[PDB]
From Swiss-Prot:
Gene Ontology biological-process entries: 3'-UTR-mediated mRNA stabilization; cellular response to vascular endothelial growth factor stimulus; DNA damage response; inflammatory response; inner ear development; intracellular signal transduction; leukotriene metabolic process; macropinocytosis
Parent-protein start and end of this portion: 46 to 345 of 400
The protein's name in its UniProt record: MAP kinase-activated protein kinase 2
Native species: Homo sapiens (Human)
Taxonomic path: Eukaryota, Metazoa, Chordata, Craniata, Vertebrata
Catalytic residues as annotated in Swiss-Prot or TrEMBL: D135
Post-translational modification summary for this protein: Sumoylation inhibits the protein kinase activity.
Assembly with partners or alone: Heterodimer with p38-alpha/MAPK14; this heterodimer forms a stable complex: molecules are positioned 'face to face' so that the ATP-binding sites of both kinases are at the heterodimer interface. Interacts with PHC2. Interacts with HSF1.
EC number of the protein: 2.7.11.1
Recorded GO MF terms: ATP binding; calcium-dependent protein serine/threonine kinase activity; calcium/calmodulin-dependent protein kinase activity; calmodulin binding; mitogen-activated protein kinase binding; protein kinase activity; protein serine kinase activity; protein serine/threonine kinase activity
């Protein structure tokens, strides 16, 4: 009987259990994400502050329900305190330090693969529980440590969304209509995989067009040493039509992804280019 705990919105002042500092781990939509310390254990953690409101509690739940996944940043616990006469939602997160995906990179095809593989997993799990991130951009991919074995994790559920309301032989369609399709998630993947391998994004900067038109290239030299197999994989991800685009399940099985170990240590110009513009 495997069961994890349900989420609990703590009401006591976060200050008693934690020690909040002025350091800024970073900025964004909701504001500053401060670095905090756990008194009794003295470990560092990220603190996110949301206005308490229905939409917010939904996000938090989704993320908390997905923290059981290795490659998703974990929510240690959440508070509902009173901030400025305003009822807020304080979220404590494991503190990722390694830095954003591309940074670490700039600062082998096989490595690019392995990276794609973990991002894939972050998505496979979310989807396997009916959730679409819908904001899988590089920025939201931080490394745990600076160490060489740091692990990659996806974060930010400000747009996370439930795709499911309300017979061994029945088709997935019949199971019911679930919209908000995660396809974009698979698109974000292509973009990322692209950038990794060469150092720049597929669609450059009438860009909104080149996209809708779905017109890009694997410019030489950059892609001169890249397999048509790897190339073919980007294409099925970069399909302009959702329903035509590859599935997360089909991605995790594609050879390049499923067998990183056995993938060419062919160098990539990435860092260089990545640093050039
Ligand atoms: N758990 C974390 N560990 C380390 N840094 C974080 C963490 N969460 C957020 N950050 C920093 O704060 C910024 C805000 O991140 P994000 O989760 O995307 O929230 P939002 O997009 O709503 O601003 C990130 O770009 C990052 O630099």
């Amino acid at each position: 009987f495997h069961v994890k705990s349900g989420l609990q919105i703590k009401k006591n002042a976060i200050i008693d259990d934690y020690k909040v500092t002025s350091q800024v781990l970073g900025l964004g939509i909701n504001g500053k994400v401060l670095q905090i310390f756990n008194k009794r254990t003295q470990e560092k953690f990220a603190l996110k502050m949301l206005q308490d409101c229905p939409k917010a509690r939904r996000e938090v739940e989704l993320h908390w329900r997905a923290s059981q996944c290795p490659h998703i940043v974990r929510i240690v616990d959440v508070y509902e305190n009173l901030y400025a006469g305003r009822k807020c939602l304080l979220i404590v997160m494991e503190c990722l330090d390694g830095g954003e995906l591309f940074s670490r990179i700039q600062d082998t095809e096989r490595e690019a693969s392995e990276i794609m593989k973990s991002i894939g997993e972050a998505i496979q799990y979310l989807h396997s529980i009916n959730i679409a991130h819908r904001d899988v951009k590089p920025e939201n991919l931080l490394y745990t440590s600076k160490r060489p074995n740091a692990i990659l994790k996806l974060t930010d559920f400000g747009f996370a969304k439930e795709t499911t309301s309300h017979p061994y032989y029945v088709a997935p369609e019949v199971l019911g209509p679930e919209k908000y399709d995660k396809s974009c998630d698979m698109w974000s993947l292509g973009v990322i995989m692209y950038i990794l391998l060469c150092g720049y994004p597929p669609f450059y900067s009438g860009m909104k067009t080149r996209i809708r038109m779905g017109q890009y290239e694997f410019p030489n030299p950059e892609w001169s040493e890249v397999s048509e197999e790897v190339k073919m994989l980007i294409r099925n991800l970069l399909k302009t039509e959702p329903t035509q685009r590859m599935t997360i399940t089909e991605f995790m099985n594609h050879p390049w992804i499923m067998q990183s170990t056995k993938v060419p240590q062919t160098p990539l110009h990435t860092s260089r280019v990545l640093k050039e513009d």
